């Protein structure tokens, strides 16, 4: 119907104390038929994490687009790109095709290595920088997510406190939604290591 | 010389070499004459063979039904000029329903010729024309040089040893301009004019070409038998 | 709508496509394949829009074989899957959309692994243990999930397929007139004659 | 028009040869010396950069080593200028390929692209040819470590060691005495530097006149690593071989 | 040197050699003049009769631009017809946009930049013609003579062609006997006298006189060819004065 | 027309030289002497501005241009060439970087654009190479300060300090001795004037000399107090008044 | 050879052609002075009409570019008309894109950049003319910029141009060392016309009447040029002092 | 959305709220909608949030380019005239609704510009979805010859007018003061009302409560030396 | 939006309102609708405020260029400028512009450019949305030739009838006087005229 609802997917992200956490679900459907139980909608360029949701194809194309752009940068400046900088790039590619645009909703989460600051941002279809220091939600149960987190989330958390919040909040919302579920993946991103953890959760 | 190699370069004399080399090239070709009264205009042209077994080349091009030309010089570059003249005659009639005045055509061939000597990477069109044609405002004969100057005459000739025909025509000037509505005698004057310029090659039936356009006479080429009456 | 099934058995791919070619009100022809062998070790099957389906099949078949004679060596089925996705991406923004859904099954000789991919028409590649396009998906995704064991041998897999046609035939509303089957396994590309 | 200003930079001479192209070979042989050695267990690239005073910057130097994508590097002999443009284009090409086939460009194809670009300045367009020859060091899946050199004409070929720049004569003779197939990365590193010690006209090969880089498929399991030494790891490996 | 083989390259003197060569090819052309009146302008040119085979009054060399500007030229006659073509474009386009006949100091700049253009590039050949052109607008008379340099100036009269030195002499006489101007009907007659006398030096072949005028009073600001009686009288008035 | 200035003017000569490129470096050797020194906490670049004539005042003329908030530039060579380069240099910096990354370019990338202009002017026929050497001095967050020197062929090198221009060879051995790697911002500035006084013979005042630093961030020149995340510009041309003080410290 | 007929480096270091454009400048033998006042700028140029036929109202070397910007050009008149047209276009263009009259400085810098492309390109020759632009800008006051066939320029306190410009040059030098001000102090713009014409007669030594001069004056928000009546009436005022 | 702009005797003050809405759901509680063309020309925006912020960026570079090139402060008019042209070239798809204000050498200025390329001046203008609410308060209290300290009081109350009666106005209230002949001052979070009341209890959970399937450590660090 | 402009003996006086509606809600209450395109040739814009304001500058540009090459342009000329941009882009621009100017040669002249785009010289024009209600009062009471004083009244009373019957017109009336003597702005606040 709407291009945005043709495969669902949700992405949430939160900042915490000396760590951030980004999380999606695994489900990739075509309308009411669920197609596959795999499919990651988080990707990672350096120590930045970029999760993209919505209209099936453009998630993919727009991914090998950021692969292509991140690469050319690390060959020029001989470093790894910093999240503050990366946020500007996602706006700037998006806005390029204003008309006929991509139906996506990408969400950036990483840590600035030079200052130690956690840092998240959001976008839209057209694509504007969405500042926050709390948390950003995105997708087709973006309304439903939005209340849930706000409720739970305590300003500042410990890296394994944080891991409890984003979990219950990400689970419960996917079971009140028709195009999501089917397991979920929650990443906890610290100044040294990345953990990828799968979530035991109700199919249906 | 030293300025010849480019058409671009105007020489410290004050004449363009290339345009004089074009102008030279016509004097080497086959001889041709045109003359006109007030009712008719004739062209008489000498055709030449490439050897014995070769047939005789055609110098007289039907451009339309009240105009034509003859060529003398580069025959390839004549087919380009004459295809322009086609288009432009039809163009006028299509859009504005109007036969192209003979006078008007003159500037339009000049202008296109001029255009190709100023630009780089051009060369002159190395060919001269006599344009004859009978329109609304009477008979005209314009002579197109490769220089681009269009001149309106009672008679002329261009090609080889044409001074001989001029000389003859300036004696007869007063005879034939008074001859009017007599196509057979008008044509006779032209054939006699080309005899003076001839160095050998007696006029046979497949050397001579005669064209006449006139008051009510659409542009008709004579060869074969039709010129056996006028030898 | 034409039927087109996939299933990835323990060391082979079995693709199966419908025989019926139905333009307008009448079935023109009933023995026509809808598959083009890309490479000695890749098969691509295709169905969707009338007339588009054919042009977009040779367009890939040429460009792929061109890379194989330039390098004297075929691209891994893993890569060939991506190349298709690319052109089906570019075609949805273009003045004319193509509208073709494709299954690429190929036997990866380096990994010694058989792989299957489902590329829908918008432009999404997705690796799958088994899949389908069209209305076929609705009826066979439930039959396969009951019985598919990863361990099955090439011969269990055939016998699973013969359940899957006979299913479609009870519930479908349009004839399709039995499939052709093909195997792609490490030893080359052969065709079973028995449905 | 422009007849008097004609430079005809693409015409055959009566010899059957191409003049501006021979002249470009010349150019490349003045430049500072680079050498390559393929081992069975890596590829070494060691280059000497030139016209260097203590006052010139030393630590942050790049003029001779450039990374392409994680498995492929080049060393460059000739005009720095010319070479940049053919790097920019190459980088973009590498990536293009990755966005279309999701796997890295083979070393073969990458060099076949660059050589055509070079050819095509000498077909038409009266442009002057490039003042470049590369060494390419690469690691794909279907051949292992592969070394390639390329010429300003187009021509490119395979090697087990090669050099370019100044004293290719002097360098290539020594190299035929001394290659052996057991070669390790410690053996190959040594036989590299020393060839440059003998053929440098400088007073001595020293750690401030070198740029140095390896590519091992070893070093952290099978996963291909690349190391571009800092000027404190060249000083330590100039002392391991006792040049000083 | 080598600057004579080239087009539009400065030599060490500052000179452009090509442009000075263009003047050589003007001196070959026929004499022509323009006389500025108190209220109009007159042009005349000397048309050498080559042979008894030309037709009287058809090879006219005075080409009119729009409906109120006369142009006459000497030097290579084709070049001239191109310079004039071009002026028609410039005329018609100015009138489409601003809808008033083009002013004559306007018209002067447009032609001027176009001359001038052919000394920027050395791929095109400079124009071997000098043109006298002008006419009348709501500001009045203006007269202009154009050179292969890209220069024009305002004049009281002007002259170019073969006998131009003869002309320039006689011209100044006409300015010093009339410090208050010459009026329209008279100036045609004087025109003739200056052409018949300037043809003393070119007296190899017969000629024909050809005159034109555009005046605020006589013709309603349009241009026309002088014809009929007043053409006849002015032919007879020149021919008795040189005798 | 048939414009055919397509073919490159520069060629290689039998001898493995690039004939024009060699000539251009002569046109850099005749221009006016200038220098750059890099320190611990800043850079200084300096030249002389010499009046064409007396009635002229070269105040309006600037031989020191800000490129971006952190990267200043000073040249030796041809007057016009330096100016046109700088305007294209700016324009490209905001199109292929600043738009598409937020921040201004890092130092060593902007030079790579500058060089890619200069390459073209010898490859694509019909144009003679530029006749200037640039110093580009600058400072970004990651790499610290730096200094780079850009030849008209397209070659660029980083430096610790350098000079170029008329008395370049002279000034250069005078830099070698005086330089060390522990230099106050201040003490760099005192060397600059001394070194510019050896190889210059014109008048010495604040109005013919130019000094400029890349230094610390100024919140004076921020333009807009009241947001701390903005720190404000590092380039800062030194006022006339300050120089006359530093001339007691020659 | 090749170098002495187009724009590429010599083995010298010196573009020959470019340098020849400067010899080219001084072929009309016209001498120009431009001085600044407190509120104005004056520039005066000899007007020498060679013949009786040429009309004296159309001989000029001062062109009016916009409201506030006059320019005197020195050299061959084809090139001058090419500079004038081109100047005008730019004038127009600026005012439309940013919505305020192009200040003088910007215009000067624009024809200098525009000069520059002409020497680097191979098929364009550079135009043999020196351009002097005058105005009372809106924020900077009286201003002079003088631009040169290379594309060089710099500002000025006063200027001279022509063949015999060395006389005027050095006259002006004595004047500003003595007074120790930048610009002629006098407040009126009558007054500084008077200084200007007087200083010219004295620097070249030759007397001038009402037909040998041509004045431009620029004040704040209007440029005008003076008629033969106002040059003559100002020569009267000069003799009485 | 509410952005007012009030002139006063020596300058201009531009003020806004921070709530950014997308539909009925409140996207982000804080967001400075004040942007900076140039150090003395601010603009804030209303309408589509992408389309200002992109077009404020693009006319920034060119004015920042242009200001170096003519070597003088940039002038308000210029930014305005540039905007006016760029918006008019697309027939008003770019849903921009900008207040551009600023000081410069030639005085105080304050403009408004609607998507199609219409442009107005005024002494007090307002845009956004509250604007009618704000506009009211202005048309009563505003008078001639204001000072600085008064005019900021007028601005805040007009935003507060927003906050209370418009749904898309909430939260913090930014300001930015520009006065002729000084640096401009940014006063972010000048008025903070409706602080969030505390929660009734904590919601921290127990470690180990959410069941997990399995874990991995997936190292993003570039290939290590050994 | 009510714009008119009226000729007299000594020149021509242009007169406008200053309200700018967009539907119910009034956008601006003090809009200058009288715009300079030369220095003695003024215009009135009506219709879609965007489409005229864009034209208003582009006309200002062509003219400024024509000054600097040819000298001043007659009012006639300037009117033609508006023509050739409106005739070619007639699809998507909807402009009613009145061009009035005072040459010293032929005194005040008015041309109106209706929406089709064509020139028409008139001895007085009325245009805009609100003006339809005042066609009749203007026609009856227009005397040919007037003194400066009378005109100022003929335009005051005209526009005030317009304001009164139209929802889209109000504010203050601005008038611009073009004579030989220069350009004088005159302004009448609502209390001076709604009582008359």
From Swiss-Prot, chain C:
Chief subcellular location: cytoplasm
Keyword line: Acetylation, Cytoplasm, Nucleus, Phosphoprotein, Proteasome
Signal peptide extent: none
Residues the record lists as Phosphoserine modifications: 76
CDD domains (alphabetical): proteasome_beta_type_2 (cd03758)
Modified residues (N-acetylmethionine): 1
GO molecular function, a single term: endopeptidase activator activity
Cell compartment(s), UniProt: Cytoplasm; Nucleus
Additional observations: Present with 21800 molecules/cell in log phase SD medium.
Top-level lineage group: Eukaryota
GO cellular component: cytosol; endoplasmic reticulum membrane; nucleus; proteasome complex; proteasome core complex, beta-subunit complex
Function: Non-catalytic component of the proteasome which degrades poly-ubiquitinated proteins in the cytoplasm and in the nucleus. It is essential for the regulated turnover of proteins and for the removal of misfolded proteins. The proteasome is a multicatalytic proteinase complex that is characterized by its ability to cleave peptides with Arg, Phe, Tyr, Leu, and Glu adjacent to the leaving group at neutral or slightly basic pH. It has an ATP-dependent proteolytic activity. This subunit has a chymotrypsin-like activity.
Alphabetical GO biological process terms: proteasomal ubiquitin-independent protein catabolic process; proteasome-mediated ubiquitin-dependent protein catabolic process
Name assigned to this protein: Proteasome subunit beta type-4
Transmembrane intervals: none
Family from the record: Belongs to the peptidase T1B family.
Swiss-Prot record, chain E:
Keyword Lipid metabolism: no
Cell compartments where the protein resides: Cytoplasm; Nucleus
Additional notes on this entry: Present with 12000 molecules/cell in log phase SD medium.
Record GO terms (molecular function): mRNA binding
Origin superkingdom: Eukaryota
Family: Belongs to the peptidase T1A family.
GO biological process, one term: proteasome-mediated ubiquitin-dependent protein catabolic process
Name of the molecule in the record: Probable proteasome subunit alpha type-7
Residue range from the parent sequence: 6 to 248 of 288
Lineage, top ranks: Eukaryota, Fungi, Dikarya, Ascomycota, Saccharomycotina
UniProt KW keywords: Acetylation, Cytoplasm, Nucleus, Proteasome
Post-translational modification remark: The alpha and beta forms are probably products of the same gene with different post-translational modifications.
The encoding gene: PRE10
Subunit structure: The 26S proteasome consists of a 20S proteasome core and two 19S regulatory subunits. The 20S proteasome core is composed of 28 subunits that are arranged in four stacked rings, resulting in a barrel-shaped structure. The two end rings are each formed by seven alpha subunits, and the two central rings are each formed by seven beta subunits. The catalytic chamber with the active sites is on the inside of the barrel.
The keyword Cytoplasm appears for this protein: yes
GO cellular component: nucleus; proteasome complex; proteasome core complex, alpha-subunit complex; proteasome storage granule
Curated annotation (Swiss-Prot), chain F:
Pfam families: Proteasome, Proteasome_A_N
Disulfide cysteine pairs (residue numbers): none
SMART domains with a match to the protein in the record: Proteasome_A_N (SM00948)
Glycyl lysine isopeptide (Lys-Gly) (interchain with G-Cter in ubiquitin) cross-link, chain position(s): 108
Keywords annotated in UniProt: Cytoplasm, Isopeptide bond, Nucleus, Proteasome, Ubl conjugation
Protein's UniProt keywords contain Cytoplasm: yes
GO terms, biological process: proteasomal ubiquitin-independent protein catabolic process; proteasome-mediated ubiquitin-dependent protein catabolic process
Superkingdom in the source lineage: Eukaryota
InterPro entries listed in its UniProt record: Ntn_hydrolases_N (IPR029055), Proteasome_alpha (IPR050115), Proteasome_alpha-type (IPR023332), Proteasome_asu_N (IPR000426), Proteasome_sua/b (IPR001353)
Localization annotation: Cytoplasm; Nucleus
Family to which the UniProt record says this protein belongs: Belongs to the peptidase T1A family.
Function: The proteasome degrades poly-ubiquitinated proteins in the cytoplasm and in the nucleus. It is essential for the regulated turnover of proteins and for the removal of misfolded proteins. The proteasome is a multicatalytic proteinase complex that is characterized by its ability to cleave peptides with Arg, Phe, Tyr, Leu, and Glu adjacent to the leaving group at neutral or slightly basic pH. It has an ATP-dependent proteolytic activity.
Misc remark: Present with 7060 molecules/cell in log phase SD medium.
Protein name: Proteasome subunit alpha type-2
UniProt organism field: Saccharomyces cerevisiae (strain ATCC 204508 / S288c)
From Swiss-Prot, chain I:
Keywords noted in UniProt: Acetylation, Cytoplasm, Hydrolase, Nucleus, Protease, Proteasome, Threonine protease, Zymogen
Lineage per the UniProt record: Eukaryota, Fungi, Dikarya, Ascomycota, Saccharomycotina
Main localization, broad class: cytoplasm
UniProt-annotated location(s): Cytoplasm; Nucleus
GO CC field: cytosol; nucleus; proteasome complex; proteasome core complex, beta-subunit complex; proteasome storage granule
Additional free-text comment from the UniProt record: The side chain of Thr-1 acts as a nucleophile, and the N-terminal amino group acts as a proton acceptor.
Quaternary state and interactors: The 26S proteasome consists of a 20S proteasome core and two 19S regulatory subunits. The 20S proteasome core is composed of 28 subunits that are arranged in four stacked rings, resulting in a barrel-shaped structure. The two end rings are each formed by seven alpha subunits, and the two central rings are each formed by seven beta subunits. The catalytic chamber with the active sites is on the inside of the barrel.
One of the GO biological process terms: proteasomal ubiquitin-independent protein catabolic process
Species, as recorded: Saccharomyces cerevisiae (strain ATCC 204508 / S288c) (Baker's yeast)
Family of this protein: Belongs to the peptidase T1B family.
Pfam family, one: Proteasome
Protein known as: Proteasome subunit beta type-1
Catalytic activity: Cleavage of peptide bonds with very broad specificity
Active-site residues, as the UniProt record annotates them: 1 (nucleophile)
EC number(s) recorded for this UniProt protein: 3.4.25.1
GO molecular function: endopeptidase activity; threonine-type endopeptidase activity
Keyword Acetylation: yes
């Amino acid at each position: 119907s709407d291009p945005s609802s043709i495969n669902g997917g949700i992405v949430v992200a939160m900042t915490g104390k000396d760590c951030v956490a980004i999380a999606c679900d695994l489900r990739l459907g075509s309308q009411s038929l669920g197609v596959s139980n795999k499919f990651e909608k988080i990707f990672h360029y350096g120590h930045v994490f970029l999760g993209i949701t919505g209209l099936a194809t453009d998630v993919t194309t727009l991914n090998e687009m950021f692969r292509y752009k991140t690469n050319l940068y690390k060959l020029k400046e001989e470093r790894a790109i910093e999240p503050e900088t990366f946020t500007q790039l996602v706006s700037s590619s998006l806005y390029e095709r204003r008309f006929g645009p991509y139906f996506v909703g990408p969400v950036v989460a990483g840590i600035n290595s030079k200052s130690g600051k956690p840092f998240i941002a959001g976008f839209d279809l057209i694509g504007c920088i969405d500042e926050a220091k709390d948390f950003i939600v995105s997708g087709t149960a973006s309304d439903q997510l939005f209340g849930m987190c706000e409720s739970l989330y305590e300003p500042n958390l410990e890296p394994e406190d944080l891991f409890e919040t984003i979990s219950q909040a990400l689970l419960n919302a996917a079971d009140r939604d028709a195009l999501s579920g089917w397991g979920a993946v929650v990443y906890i991103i610290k100044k040294d290591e990345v953990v990828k953890r799968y979530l035991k959760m109700r199919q249906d | 010389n030293n300025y010849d190699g480019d058409t671009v370069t105007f020489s410290p004399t004050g004449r363009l070499f290339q345009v004089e080399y074009a102008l030279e090239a016509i004097k080497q070709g086959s001889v041709t004459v045109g003359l006109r009264s007030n009712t008719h205009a004739v062209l008489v042209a000498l055709k030449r063979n490439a050897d014995e077994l070769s047939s005789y080349q055609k110098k007289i091009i039907k451009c339309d039904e009240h105009m034509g030309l003859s060529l003398a010089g580069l025959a390839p570059d004549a087919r380009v000029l004459s295809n322009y003249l086609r288009q432009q005659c039809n163009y006028s009639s299509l859009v504005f329903n109007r036969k192209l005045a003979v006078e008007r055509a003159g500037h339009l061939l000049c202008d296109k010729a001029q255009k190709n000597t100023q630009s780089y990477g051009g060369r002159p069109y190395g060919v001269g024309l006599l344009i004859i044609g009978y329109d609304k405002s009477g008979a005209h004969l314009l002579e197109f040089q490769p220089s681009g100057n269009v001149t309106e005459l009672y008679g002329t000739a261009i090609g080889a040893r044409s001074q001989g025909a001029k000389t003859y025509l300036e004696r007869t000037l007063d005879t034939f301009i008074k001859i009017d509505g007599n196509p057979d005698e008008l044509i006779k004057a032209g054939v006699e004019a080309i005899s003076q310029s001839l160095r050998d090659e007696s006029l046979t039936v497949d050397n001579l070409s005669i064209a006449i356009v006139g008051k009510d006479t659409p542009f008709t080429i004579y060869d074969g038998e039709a010129v056996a009456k006028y030898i | 709508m034409d039927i087109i099934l996939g299933i990835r058995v323990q060391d082979s791919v079995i693709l199966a496509s419908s025989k019926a070619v139905t333009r307008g009100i009448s079935v023109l022809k009933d023995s026509d394949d809808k598959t083009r062998q890309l490479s000695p070790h890749t098969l691509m099957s295709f169905a969707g829009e009338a007339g588009d389906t054919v042009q977009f099949a040779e367009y890939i078949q040429a460009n792929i074989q061109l890379y194989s004679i330039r390098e004297d060596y075929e691209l891994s089925p893993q890569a060939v899957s991506s190349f298709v996705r690319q052109e089906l991406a570019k075609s949805i923004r273009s003045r004319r959309p193509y509208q073709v859904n494709v299954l690429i099954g190929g036997y990866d000789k380096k990994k010694n692994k058989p792989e299957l991919y489902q590329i829908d028409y918008l432009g999404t590649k997705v690796e799958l243990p088994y899949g389908a396009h069209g209305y076929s998906g609705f009826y066979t995704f439930s039959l396969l999930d009951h019985h598919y064991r990863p361990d099955m041998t090439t011969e269990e897999g055939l016998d699973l397929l013969k359940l899957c046609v006979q299913e479609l035939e009870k519930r479908m509303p349009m004839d399709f007139k039995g499939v052709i089957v093909k195997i792609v396994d490490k030893d080359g590309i052969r065709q079973v004659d028995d449905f | 028009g422009s007849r008097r200003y004609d430079s005809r930079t693409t015409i055959f001479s009566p010899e059957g040869r191409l003049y501006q192209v021979e002249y470009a070979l010349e150019s490349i042989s003045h430049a500072g010396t680079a050498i390559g050695i393929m081992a069975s267990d890596g590829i070494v690239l060691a280059a000497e950069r030139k016209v260097t005073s203590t006052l010139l910057e030393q630590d942050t130097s790049t003029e001779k080593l450039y990374k392409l994508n994680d498995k492929i590097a080049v060393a460059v002999a000739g005009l720095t200028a010319d070479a940049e443009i053919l790097i920019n284009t190459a980088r973009i090409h590498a990536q293009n390929y990755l966005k279309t086939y999701n796997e890295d460009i083979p070393v073969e194809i990458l060099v076949r692209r660059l050589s055509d670009i070079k050819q095509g300045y000498t077909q038409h367009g009266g442009l002057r040819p490039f003042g470049v020859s590369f060494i390419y060091a690469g690691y794909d899946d279907r051949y292992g470590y592969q070394l390639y050199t390329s010429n300003p004409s187009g021509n490119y070929t395979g090697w087990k060691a090669i050099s370019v720049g100044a004293n290719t004569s002097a360098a290539q003779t020594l190299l035929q005495m001394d290659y052996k197939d057991d070669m390790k990365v410690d053996d190959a590193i040594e036989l590299a530097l020393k060839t440059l010690s003998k053929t440098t006209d400088s007073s001595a090969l020293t750690y401030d006149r070198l740029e140095f880089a390896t590519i091992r498929k070893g070093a952290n399991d099978g996963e291909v690593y690349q190391k571009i030494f800092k000027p404190q790891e060249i000083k330590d490996i100039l002392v391991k071989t006792g040049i000083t | 040197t080598g600057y004579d083989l080239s087009n539009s390259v400065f030599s060490p003197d500052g000179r452009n050699f090509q442009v000075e060569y263009a003047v050589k090819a003007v001196e070959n052309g026929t004499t022509s003049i323009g006389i500025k009146c108190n209220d109009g302008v007159v042009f005349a040119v000397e048309k050498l009769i080559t042979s008894k085979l030309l037709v009287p009054q058809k090879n006219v060399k005075i080409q009119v631009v729009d409906r109120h500007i006369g142009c006459v030229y000497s030097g290579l006659i084709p070049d001239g017809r191109h310079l004039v073509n071009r002026g028609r474009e410039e005329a018609a386009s100015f009138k489409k946009l601003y809808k008033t006949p083009i002013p004559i100091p306007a018209f002067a700049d447009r032609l001027g930049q176009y001359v001038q253009a052919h000394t920027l590039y050395n791929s095109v050949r400079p124009f071997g013609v000098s043109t006298i052109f002008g006419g009348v607008d709501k500001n009045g008379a203006h007269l202009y003579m154009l050179e292969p340099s890209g220069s024009y100036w305002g004049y009281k009269g002007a002259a170019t062609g073969k006998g131009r030195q003869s002309a320039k002499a006689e011209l100044e006489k006409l300015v010093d006997h009339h410090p208050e101007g010459l009026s329209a009907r008279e100036a045609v007659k004087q025109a003739a006298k200056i052409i018949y006398l300037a043809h003393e030096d070119n007296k190899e072949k017969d000629f024909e006189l050809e005159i034109s005028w555009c005046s605020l009073s006589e013709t309603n600001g349009l241009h026309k060819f002088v014809k009929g009686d007043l053409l006849q009288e002015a032919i007879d008035f020149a021919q008795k004065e040189i005798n | 027309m048939t414009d055919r200035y397509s073919f490159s003017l520069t060629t290689f000569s039998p001898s493995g030289k690039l004939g024009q490129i060699d000539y251009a470096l002569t046109a850099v050797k005749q221009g006016v002497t200038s220098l750059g020194i890099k320190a611990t906490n800043g850079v200084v670049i300096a030249t002389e501005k010499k009046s064409s004539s007396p009635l002229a005042m070269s105040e309006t003329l600037s031989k020191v241009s800000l490129l971006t908030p952190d990267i200043g530039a000073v040249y030796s060579g041809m007057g016009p060439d330096y100016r046109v380069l700088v305007d294209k240099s700016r324009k490209v910096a905001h199109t292929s970087y600043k738009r598409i990354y937020g921040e201004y370019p890092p130092t060593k990338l902007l030079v790579s654009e500058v060089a890619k202009i200069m390459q073209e002017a010898t490859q694509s026929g019909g144009v003679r190479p530029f006749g200037v050497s640039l110093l580009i001095a600058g400072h970004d967050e990651f790499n610290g300060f730096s200094l780079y020197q850009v030849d008209p062929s397209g070659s660029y090198f980083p430096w610790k300090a350098t000079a170029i221009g008329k008395g370049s060879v002279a000034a250069k051995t005078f830099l070698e001795k005086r330089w060390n790697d522990e230099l106050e911002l201040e003490d760099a500035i005192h060397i600059a004037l001394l070194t510019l006084k050896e190889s210059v013979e014109g008048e010495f005042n604040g109005d013919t000399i130019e000094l400029a630093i890349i230094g610390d961030e100024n919140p004076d020149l921020l333009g807009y107090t009241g947001i701390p995340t903005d720190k404000g510009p590092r380039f800062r041309k030194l006022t006339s008044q300050e120089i006359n003080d530093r001339l007691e410290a020659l | 050879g090749y170098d002495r007929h187009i724009t590429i480096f010599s083995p010298e270091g010196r573009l020959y052609q470019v340098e020849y454009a400067f010899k080219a400048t001084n072929q009309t033998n016209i001498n120009s002075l431009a001085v600044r006042g407190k509120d104005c700028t004056v520039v005066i140029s000899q007007k020498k009409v060679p013949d009786k036929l040429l009309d004296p109202t159309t001989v000029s070397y001062i062109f009016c570019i916009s409201r506030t910007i006059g320019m005197v050009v020195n050299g061959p008149i084809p090139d001058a008309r090419n500079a004038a047209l081109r100047a005008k276009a730019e004038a127009a263009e600026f005012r439309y894109k940013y919505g305020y009259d192009m200040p003088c400085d910007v215009l000067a810098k624009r024809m200098a950049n525009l000069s520059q492309i002409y020497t680097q390109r191979a098929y364009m020759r550079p135009l043999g003319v020196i351009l002097t632009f005058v105005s009372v800008d809106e924020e900077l006051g009286p201003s002079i910029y003088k631009t040169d066939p290379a594309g060089y320029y710099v500002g000025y306190k006063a200027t001279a141009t022509g063949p015999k410009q060395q006389e005027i040059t050095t006259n002006l030098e004595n004047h500003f060392k003595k007074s120790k001000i930048d610009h002629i102090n006098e407040e009126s713009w009558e007054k500084v016309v008077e200084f200007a014409i007087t200083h010219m007669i004295d620097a070249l030594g030759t007397e001038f009447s009402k037909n040998d001069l041509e004045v431009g004056v620029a004040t704040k928000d209007k440029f005008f040029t003076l008629s033969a009546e106002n040059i003559e009436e100002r020569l009267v005022a000069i003799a009485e002092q | 959305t509410t952005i007012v702009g009030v002139k006063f005797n020596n300058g201009v003050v531009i003020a806004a709220d921070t709530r950014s809405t997308q539909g009925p759901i409140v996207a982000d509680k804080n967001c400075a909608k004040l942007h900076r063309i140039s150090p003395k020309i601010w603009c804030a925006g209303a309408g589509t949030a992408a389309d200002t912020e992109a077009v404020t960026q693009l006319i920034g570079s060119n004015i920042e380019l242009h200001s170096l090139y003519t070597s003088r402060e940039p002038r308000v008019v210029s930014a305005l005239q540039m905007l006016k042209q760029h918006l008019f070239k697309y027939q008003g798809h770019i849903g921009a609704y900008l207040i551009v204000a600023g000081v410069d050498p030639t005085g105080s200025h304050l403009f408004s510009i609607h998507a199609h390329g219409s442009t107005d001046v005024g002494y007090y203008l307002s845009l956004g979805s509250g604007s009618l609410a704000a506009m009211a308060v202005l048309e009563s209290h505003w008078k001639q010859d204001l000072t600085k300290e008064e005019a900021i009081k007028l601005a805040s109350d007009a935003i507060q007018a927003g906050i209370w009666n418009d749904l898309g106005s909430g939260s913090n209230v930014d300001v930015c003061v520009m006065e002729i002949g000084k640096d401009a001052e940014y006063l972010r979070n000048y008025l903070t009302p409706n602080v969030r009341e505390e929660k009734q209890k904590s919601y921290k959970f127990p470690r180990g409560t959410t069941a997990v399937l399995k874990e991995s450590i997936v190292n993003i660090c570039d290939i290590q030396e050994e | 939006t009510s714009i008119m402009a009226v000729t007299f003996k000594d020149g021509v006086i242009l007169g406008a309102d200053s309200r700018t509606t967009t539907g119910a809600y009034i956008a601006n209450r003090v809009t200058d609708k009288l715009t300079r395109v030369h220095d003695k040739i003024w215009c009135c814009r009506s219709g879609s405020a965007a489409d005229t304001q864009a034209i208003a500058d582009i006309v200002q540009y062509h003219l400024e260029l024509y000054t600097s090459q040819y000298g001043t342009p007659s009012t006639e000329t300037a009117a033609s400028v508006f023509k050739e941009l409106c005739y070619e882009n007639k699809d998507n621009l909807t402009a009613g512009i009145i061009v009035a100017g005072y040459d010293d040669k032929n005194k005040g002249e008015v041309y109106t450019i209706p929406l089709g785009g064509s020139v028409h010289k008139l001895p007085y024009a009325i245009a805009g949305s609100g003006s339809t209600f005042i066609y009749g009062y203007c026609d009856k009471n227009f005397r040919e030739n007037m003194s400066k004083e009378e005109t100022v009244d003929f335009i005051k009373h005209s526009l005030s009838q317009a304001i009164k019957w139209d929802g889209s017109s109000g504010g203050v009336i601005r008038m611009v006087v073009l004579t030989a003597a220069g350009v004088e702005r005159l302004i009448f606040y609502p209390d001076e005229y709604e009582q008359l």
